[PDB]
Design a protein around this ligand. Structure first.
Ligand SMILES: Nc1ncnc2c1ncn2[C@@H]1O[C@H](COP(=O)(O)OP(=O)(O)OP(O)(O)=S)[C@@H](O)[C@H]1O
Ligand SMILES: [Mg+2]
Lengths: 60, 359
């Protein structure tokens, strides 16, 4: 039910492999137009907001 | 030094101006299929003076974003590399597409391609040898190459090949090509002299690489049972024949080469690549999907070699499809597509060092 998702917040208290998978999933979800992505500058937080295509199972 | 970052503007799928990086000592480029990872490989080649023929297009203007559908977004495009060195100001090497021609710049000052390539050569970047770039689907062929093509590489890196033309001329002048070569006095001595110069140039490179490759193939496979041997087919005139390359895979018995697995061929090829580096070090390697045939054991060993080498010796920029490999990088550059008339590529950056590589 959120307006936006912070990648860094999702990855708090995860290990490297889990964090990398969450990052990769953002790339896939953006390719699928399920989300829009913003990153202010290199290595800042990556923020997702709803994209122009519906997506199921987004709570995962 | 090291590649600090790449800046790209309207090059192939990289629409608009984008900063790529900054790179860490070990950075992995990742992303879903067709998002534009290879196009980034080509941008690096491009700014390092690569020929248009090798950049998957037919003419220079086709590298401008939107050309493949007749919608070029600009009459110009560029790729720029910021090269960094401790104790030194940043140096920017840029190649700009203007009109239908390339313009070369160092710190925004126009230079001819000759001076550009000469400056990069002084950093360890050999545009011709290209010993720092391993393209997609090509790591194995480095270990299965023909012996004579391996010699051509050593002639290029060692500069002994610059002597080949004069060598052939003097060889024929002293009697080569006659039924009974009668080599007497002055013409024979002139050939022996160029022969020795060519020998000396070649061996200054080959000896260093041949005597360093065994430890690297060990440290790569991390087993004492592994061995690597580089030997000339013609010891008296190594530049005349092929360079043989044979390995004993770790923990196994000797098997020729071409018999090995894709994975074992990969490690042998990387061994050769890093042994060349020990003689004439390049600042960075760009490795496109070199982990494709590696199992998980060899992925760890290659990644660990890079990490224990990315602090001191060199920087590694890899493109990988395998989380087993790219989760060992310090940071990730993720490539993703934006919807449009043609494929639009953009990137994210993610620092993996914030997270424990454990449980
Ligand atoms: N000048 C250009 N303008 C727009 N798109 C281009 C241009 N040049 C190449 N492309 C596109 O780049 C896309 C593929 O580029 P790549 O870098 O090879 O992607 P990729 O992620 O490496 O795909 P793989 O390796 O097959 S999974 C193609 O769809 C091209 O149409
Ligand atoms: Mg690719």
């Amino acid at each position: 039910g959120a307006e936006s998702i912070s990648l860094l917040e999702l990855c708090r208290n995860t290990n490297r492999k889990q964090a990398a998978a969450k990052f990769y999933s953002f790339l896939v979800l953006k390719k699928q137009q399920a989300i829009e992505l913003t990153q202010e500058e290199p290595y800042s937080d990556i923020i997702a907001t709803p994209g122009p295509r519906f997506h199921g199972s987004l709570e995962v | 030094g090291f590649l600090k970052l790449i800046e790209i503007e309207n090059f192939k799928s990289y629409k608009g101006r984008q900063i790529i990086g900054p790179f860490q000592r070990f950075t992995a480029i990742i992303g879903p299929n067709g998002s534009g990872k290879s196009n980034l490989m080509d941008a690096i080649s491009f700014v390092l003076g690569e020929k248009t023929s090798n950049l998957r297009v037919k003419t220079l203007r086709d590298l401008i974003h939107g050309a493949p559908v007749g919608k070029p977004a600009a009459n110009r495009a560029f790729v720029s590399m910021v090269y960094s060195e401790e104790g030194a100001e940043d140096r920017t090497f840029a190649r700009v597409i203007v009109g239908g021609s390339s313009e070369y710049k160092i710190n925004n000052k126009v230079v001819q391609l000759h001076e550009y390539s000469e400056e990069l050569e002084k950093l360890g970047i050999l545009i011709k040898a290209r010993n720092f770039l391993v393209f997609q689907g090509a790591v194995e062929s480095i270990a299965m190459k023909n012996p004579k093509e391996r010699t051509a590489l050593f002639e290029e890196i060692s500069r002994s090949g610059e002597l080949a033309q004069e060598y052939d001329k003097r060889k024929k002048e002293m009697g080569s090509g006659s039924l009974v070569p009668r080599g007497s006095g002055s013409a024979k001595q002139a050939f022996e002299q160029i022969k020795k110069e060519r020998f000396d140039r070649f061996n200054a490179c080959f000896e260093s690489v041949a005597t360093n490759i065994d430890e690297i193939y060990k440290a790569l496979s991390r087993n004492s049972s592994a061995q690597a041997f580089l030997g000339p087919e013609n010891p008296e005139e190594p530049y005349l024949d092929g360079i043989n390359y044979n390995c004993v895979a770790p923990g196994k018995r000797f098997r020729p080469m071409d018999n090995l697995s894709g994975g074992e061929k990969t490690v042998a090829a990387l061994a050769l690549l890093f042994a060349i580096h020990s003689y004439k070090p390049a600042p960075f390697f760009v490795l496109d999907q070199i982990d494709a045939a590696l199992d998980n054991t060899n992925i760890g060993k290659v990644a660990n070699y890079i990490k224990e080498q990315s602090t001191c010796n060199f920087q590694a920029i890899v493109i990988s499809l395998k989380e087993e490999f790219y989760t060992k990088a310090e940071s990730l550059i993720g490539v993703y597509p934006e919807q449009g008339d043609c494929v639009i590529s953009k990137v994210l950056t993610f620092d993996l060092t914030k997270y424990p590589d454990a449980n």
